[PDB]
Design an enzyme around this catalytic site. Structure first.
Site, PDB file in Angstrom:
ATOM      1  N   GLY A 102       0.806  -1.220   0.000  1.00  0.00           N
ATOM      2  CA  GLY A 102       0.000   0.000   0.000  1.00  0.00           C
ATOM      3  C   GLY A 102       0.837   1.266   0.000  1.00  0.00           C
ATOM      4  O   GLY A 102       0.636   2.134   0.851  1.00  0.00           O
ATOM      5  N   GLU A 103       1.812   1.365  -0.914  1.00  0.00           N
ATOM      6  CA  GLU A 103       2.703   2.514  -1.015  1.00  0.00           C
ATOM      7  C   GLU A 103       3.338   2.609  -2.364  1.00  0.00           C
ATOM      8  O   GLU A 103       3.927   1.644  -2.844  1.00  0.00           O
ATOM      9  CB  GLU A 103       3.722   2.619   0.132  1.00  0.00           C
ATOM     10  CG  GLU A 103       4.371   1.328   0.562  1.00  0.00           C
ATOM     11  CD  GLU A 103       4.666   1.245   2.046  1.00  0.00           C
ATOM     12  OE1 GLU A 103       5.639   1.895   2.499  1.00  0.00           O
ATOM     13  OE2 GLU A 103       3.987   0.448   2.734  1.00  0.00           O
ATOM     14  N   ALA A 104       3.162   3.768  -2.994  1.00  0.00           N
ATOM     15  CA  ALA A 104       3.593   4.100  -4.348  1.00  0.00           C
ATOM     16  C   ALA A 104       5.003   3.624  -4.782  1.00  0.00           C
ATOM     17  O   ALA A 104       5.090   2.861  -5.739  1.00  0.00           O
ATOM     18  CB  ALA A 104       3.391   5.588  -4.613  1.00  0.00           C
ATOM     19  N   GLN A 276       5.457   9.474   4.382  1.00  0.00           N
ATOM     20  CA  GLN A 276       4.792   9.326   3.072  1.00  0.00           C
ATOM     21  C   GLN A 276       3.407  10.003   3.120  1.00  0.00           C
ATOM     22  O   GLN A 276       2.635   9.710   4.038  1.00  0.00           O
ATOM     23  CB  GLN A 276       4.608   7.849   2.734  1.00  0.00           C
ATOM     24  CG  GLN A 276       5.868   7.078   2.433  1.00  0.00           C
ATOM     25  CD  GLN A 276       5.470   5.689   1.971  1.00  0.00           C
ATOM     26  OE1 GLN A 276       5.111   5.465   0.800  1.00  0.00           O
ATOM     27  NE2 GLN A 276       5.500   4.727   2.882  1.00  0.00           N
TER      28      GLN A 276
END
Length: 347
Positions: A102-104, A276
């Protein structure tokens, strides 16, 4: 799939599930003992024991920027057949394989790996590896447009709307019109089966009213700031803290929410921490969560766990989610958070 590893598979599964580091180190243990390569082998176990392993952790191991991890992935992705597969299908399969982080940046490293493999196995389909990464990011952005129930059918990206963005994408050239029609239709009829991680590692600050939060408000101003100190954003951390900022790529904050990553580093202790920022937009809201998120993660070094705790404690809003990092157990992060939240809760 080496037999010494295969023998104690259940043991390696038990260790990995409990703590990935333990399990990984137990794979390396057998590899050292039997004079064999871990990267090529970790990749294999991850593949073989898919139905058994913590897929959140696996996806998290493979998407990490560390050299060993980055190699393991090159090996994981190489062990996949993309030969004969359609660009849309080859990618459809790839993404389906993971409990998508769940992180770009973690997602990027993943998309980047597929790009390099699809091109290796199909050198005729795309002109070069950079062309495959472009097409994939356009495909993933396309997947949002073609299946967003909020956006009206009249505003959803057209076939020729694809061809336009991709003029000069095939190594400074155009892709075949019939291949893009086969791309666009394949992904029009079937959206990507994307299963995300429940809660991402470390501290996650998420609320429907976090956008209102002073600390969040300040941290956002910081992302479009030149030569400003981070103690203005987080006065609970030291004065002696250096910052680096990575702004989002071609695909903006509108198509992720991803507003960037701040890296904090104590110039005396070498304690590191990363913040983030994700702000929901019309396109993102549907796929990437309707509420703003702030993910604070500590570096591998000593005291990194405190820097991260100090930054999170400075926030007015509470940390909704705590999750063990590769090197830090859930409790230790709680211990440091409640500690700084009791410490900073003084004038």
């Amino acid at each position: 799939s080496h037999p010494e590893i295969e023998k104690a598979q259940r043991e390696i599964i038990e260790a990995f599930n409990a703590k990935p580091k333990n399990g990984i180190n137990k794979i390396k243990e057998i590899c050292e003992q039997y004079k064999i390569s871990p990267n090529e082998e970790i990749a294999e176990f991850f593949h073989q024991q898919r139905k058994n392993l913590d897929l959140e952790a696996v996806g998290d191991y493979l998407s990490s920027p560390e050299a060993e991890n980055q190699q393991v992935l090159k090996a994981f992705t190489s062990q996949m057949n993309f030969n004969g597969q359609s660009f849309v299908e080859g990618l459809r399969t790839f993404l389906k394989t993971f409990k998508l982080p769940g992180e770009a940046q973690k997602i990027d490293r993943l998309v980047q790996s597929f790009s390099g493999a699809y091109f290796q196995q199909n050198p005729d389909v795309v002109s070069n590896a950079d062309a495959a990464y472009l097409l994939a990011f356009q495909t993933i952005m396309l997947n949002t447009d073609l299946h967003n129930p909020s956006i009206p059918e009249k505003n959803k990206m057209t076939v020729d709307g694809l061809k336009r963005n991709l003029r000069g994408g095939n190594n400074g050239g155009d892709f075949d019109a019939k291949f893009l029609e086969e791309l666009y239709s394949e992904i029009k009829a079937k959206p990507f089966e994307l299963n995300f991680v429940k809660t991402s590692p470390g501290y996650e600050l998420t609320s429907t009213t976090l956008n209102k939060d002073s600390t969040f408000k300040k941290l956002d101003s910081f992302l479009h700031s030149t030569d400003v100190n981070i103690n203005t954003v987080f006065p609970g951390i030291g004065d002696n803290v250096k910052t680096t900022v990575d702004q989002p790529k071609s695909w903006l904050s509108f198509k992720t929410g991803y507003k960037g990553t701040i890296t904090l580093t104590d110039n005396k202790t070498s304690a590191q921490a990363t913040i983030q920022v994700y702000t929901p937009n019309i396109f993102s809201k549907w796929l990437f969560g309707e509420q703003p998120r702030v993910i604070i993660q500590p570096g591998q070094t000593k005291e990194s766990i405190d820097l991260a705790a100090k930054a999170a404690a400075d926030f007015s809003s509470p940390v909704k989610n705590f999750k063990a990092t590769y090197d830090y157990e859930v409790g230790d992060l709680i211990k440091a958070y409640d500690n700084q939240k009791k410490l900073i809760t003084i004038e």
